[PDB]
Design a protein around this ligand. Structure first.
Ligand SMILES: *[C@@](=O)([C]N([C])[C][C][C][C][C][C])[C]([C]C(=O)[O-])[N]C(=O)[C]([C][C])N1[C]=C(C([C])([C])[C])N=C([N][C]C2=NON=C2[C])C1=O
Ligand SMILES: *[C@@](=O)([C]N([C])[C][C][C][C][C][C])[C]([C]C(=O)[O-])[N]C(=O)[C]([C][C])N1[C]=C(C([C])([C])[C])N=C([N][C]C2=NON=C2[C])C1=O
Lengths: 140, 91, 91, 140
């Protein structure tokens, strides 16, 4: 069988982290329009049968803490896991309201040996954030 | 025994090293494209093909408009990164 | 007008930051798995699906065997990076 | 039309760079088995109707030089482009027999506005090389 088993009692969780306002001490601008995405994703994934949880303006600490607790949950009856991050960022980084957080850190909570109840199950990370400062001028 | 990095999928809104665009009233180009694509095809297409459609929608239907020449008429291409072991269907 | 970074596909043999394995007589786990899947499925499957089959085969059928404990019993997962705008069929 | 037009007179080029022997000064071990990969790839893409070109033990300079020339060729009658790199490597890097080459360096030659005859056509880079020194111990 070359297709993930998506017939578990539940599709699984869909954690949406939407960061719009950032501490002045960061110099990050307010991400106007992000709420539209958040609400959009909530409806989309509800239609897909995912247990959606929205979390707004979280500090780096709050992000790591949240992701760590989600990974410690029992996903035995869940077919998969979805995490959406909406914020500013750099390559391999997403910003909490008060500072940078390396993506590898929150992703590791869910790696095979780390999250037993998700082992062998699809783990999706949808990321809306910058990965640098290069601009694509396009062609043709 | 399987890799601990297996079965992960990262749907990046933009290519490595690049900026990612967001519209003040509609939201980010990538998220609005992803939602719209999931709406039309989540009941038909395998996830990778849906994300490819997202890549095409963002790359073709969007361009930046800014009074600032530096950020004007810019384009964007999303980046699908899959360590998945099987095909994924939302049904 | 499309992104200059669009229509690129990077079929990496392994995840970011990881080692990639090679067998002295059979070749690398990735390449031999890739060739096997292309030989069997290139006449029907879309490219991303073939690569996903490669992912599974590499993560499932291969494990290192070394007299050096540090490098013994290790696994590998390939990494598909797509900035493709359409589905790819080799026919 | 959600599938690439692959009905051009030619499928395209398949450039295979097989680096097995490295200069003593690099401290790179001979890549035993790589030839089996090169031969395997040659037969596979021949069956897929690609114009295959095998290149062995290229220096950093030769890799760059080759990639520049190939990108300067006229691909108008070709459906796509394939490049396979077999060698030692690090994150975002591949080694010539005499030193490192940034993948971004050879990849740039084919970017939208750079290789007009391939604009809008699938450009595939198959890379067999390490991307760091992390080991995956597996789970279960
Ligand atoms: C992205 O993550 C982070 N950027 C800002 C880099 C920070 C790293 C620190 C380096 C010193 C972020 C994505 C997000 O969803 O918020 N990117 C943006 O804020 C993007 C950048 C391309 N961005 C920037 C800008 C201006 C031109 C700098 C004001 N404007 C918009 N939107 C308005 C717009 N202007 O022209 N077309 C549009 C849609 C924007 O999305
Ligand atoms: C890869 O790029 C890494 N390069 C840059 C060398 C750096 C290693 C650091 C050692 C001090 C390279 C890619 C390639 O296809 O040639 N990968 C390797 O050389 C891998 C690394 C995991 N590798 C290493 C080794 C030993 C254990 C270091 C000798 N052996 C093999 N193959 C034999 C083997 N041993 O156990 N199982 C197998 C299949 C190998 O592929």
């Amino acid at each position: 069988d070359n297709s993930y088993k998506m017939d578990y009692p539940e599709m699984g969780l869909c954690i949406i982290i939407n960061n719009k306002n950032f501490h002045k001490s960061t110099g990050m601008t307010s991400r106007s329009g992000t709420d539209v995405d958040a609400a959009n994703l909530r409806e989309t994934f509800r239609n897909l049968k995912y247990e959606v949880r929205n979390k707004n303006d979280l500090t780096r600490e709050e992000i790591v803490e949240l992701m760590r607790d989600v990974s410690k949950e029992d996903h035995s009856k869940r077919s998969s896991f979805v995490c959406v991050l909406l914020s500013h960022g750099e390559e391999g980084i997403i910003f909490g309201t008060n500072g940078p957080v390396d993506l590898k850190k929150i992703t590791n909570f869910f790696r095979g040996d780390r999250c037993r109840s998700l082992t062998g199950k699809p783990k999706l990370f949808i990321i809306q954030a910058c990965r640098g400062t290069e601009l694509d001028c396009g062609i043709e | 025994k399987i890799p601990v990095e297996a079965d992960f999928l990262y749907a990046y809104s933009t290519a490595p090293g690049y900026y990612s665009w967001r519209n003040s009233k509609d939201g980010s180009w990538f998220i609005q494209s992803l939602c719209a694509m999931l709406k039309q095809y989540a009941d038909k297409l395998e996830f990778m093909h849906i994300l490819t459609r997202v890549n095409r929608k963002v790359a073709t239907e969007f361009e930046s408009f800014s009074f600032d020449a530096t950020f004007h008429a810019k384009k964007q291409i999303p980046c699908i990164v899959s360590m998945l072991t099987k095909e994924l269907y939302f049904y």
